[PDB]
């Protein structure tokens, strides 16, 4: 009975940039939501398509969890079926969303006193995009404990869950 490893997924030192954001697949092991659900130390929790409490007494083939940054004020911008700067550039969502959404404060970890520079995104999709490549097309963050709640480094992970043909991997 192992755990689903979830303690590099959520207290990774570093994640990556919203261009390049890292999914780790997750089959073939027991998780547990209602934790994650009872962490009580998340700044946006949300849970598409299904209660997080119910979601440890279900089981699922395929999980897919992205892990990137993005800024304070854009966490609004994850949703399904909108328009945004991550929406059109960095990371574009489909309608029909039953994974779950959590996004958390990390001033303390993504930003340092003299700027924080470690993000890029794509200033200049459909989808799931991840995309790598007289301006270049990209810019990069600029993070301080003192730049402001709109700005502040938030780090966003998204929970995709896929039922296919297979027998059922995950389950709680």
């Given at each position: 009975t192992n755990l689903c490893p979830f303690g590099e997924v959520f207290n990774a030192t570093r994640f990556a940039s919203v261009y390049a954001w890292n999914r780790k697949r997750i089959s073939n092991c027991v998780a547990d939501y209602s934790v994650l659900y009872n962490s009580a130390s998340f700044s946006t929790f949300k849970c598409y398509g299904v209660s997080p409490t119910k979601l440890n007494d279900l089981c699922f083939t395929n999980?897919?969890?992205?892990?990137?940054?993005?800024?304070?004020?854009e966490v609004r911008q994850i949703a399904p079926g909108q328009t945004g700067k991550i929406?059109?550039?960095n990371y574009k969502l489909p309608d029909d969303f039953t994974g779950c959404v959590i996004a958390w404060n990390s001033n303390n970890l993504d930003s340092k006193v003299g700027g924080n520079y470690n993000y890029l995104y794509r200033l200049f999709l459909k989808p799931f995009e991840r995309d790598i490549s007289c301006?270049?097309?990209?810019?990069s963050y600029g993070f301080?404990?003192?730049?402001?709640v709109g700005y502040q480094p938030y780090r966003?992970?998204?929970?995709?869950?896929?039922?296919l043909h297979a027998p059922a991997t995950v389950c709680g």
């Open positions: 999980v897919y969890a992205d892990s990137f940054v993005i800024r304070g004020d929406a059109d550039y301006y270049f097309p990209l810019q301080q404990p003192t730049n402001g966003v992970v998204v929970l995709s869950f896929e039922l």
